[PDB]
Design a protein around this ligand. Sequence first.
Ligand SMILES: CNC(=O)c1n[nH]c2ccc(Br)cc12
Length: 164
Amino acid sequence: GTSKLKYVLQDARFFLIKSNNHENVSLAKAKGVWSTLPVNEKKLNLAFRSARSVILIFSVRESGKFQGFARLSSESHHGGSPIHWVLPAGMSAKMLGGVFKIDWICRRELPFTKSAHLTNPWNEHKPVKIGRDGQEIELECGTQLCLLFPPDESIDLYQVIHKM
Ligand SMILES: CNC(=O)c1n[nH]c2ccc(Br)cc12
């Protein structure tokens, strides 16, 4: 069903995450973590304090799809086990900020062809697939985008609801 999903998404904030490679999203799905540049880290930490749920919606660059979405379960923190992110070309992971813990809500993919009717008011009403890493997606667009994903019957939102 979709009722617990709609409960989690109620009055949530949504952010577009653009990964340069599939390996970082695989690592995120396996470890329940994400890391981003400080400019986005600050935005996400502000949002985490201000909203019932902060949803990251993931897209691998050039893949033509979203790879799933997840809910922040903490602000960013430093000093955990290192995460062996792949950076594009030979760039340093030092550029990254803290680590956010995340609970996955959907690990299934959604092709951009299925979201072509959704525009994001906070990015000039361009299609929601279009946007820089960290672009905020307005509430209604973000909710409809999440509801387009195939149901992920491996996930139980009961434990996510309790963290709200
Ligand atoms: C695991 N997260 C990343 O790899 C990442 N997040 N935002 C970025 C901006 C530029 C570069 Br290069 C890499 C990233």
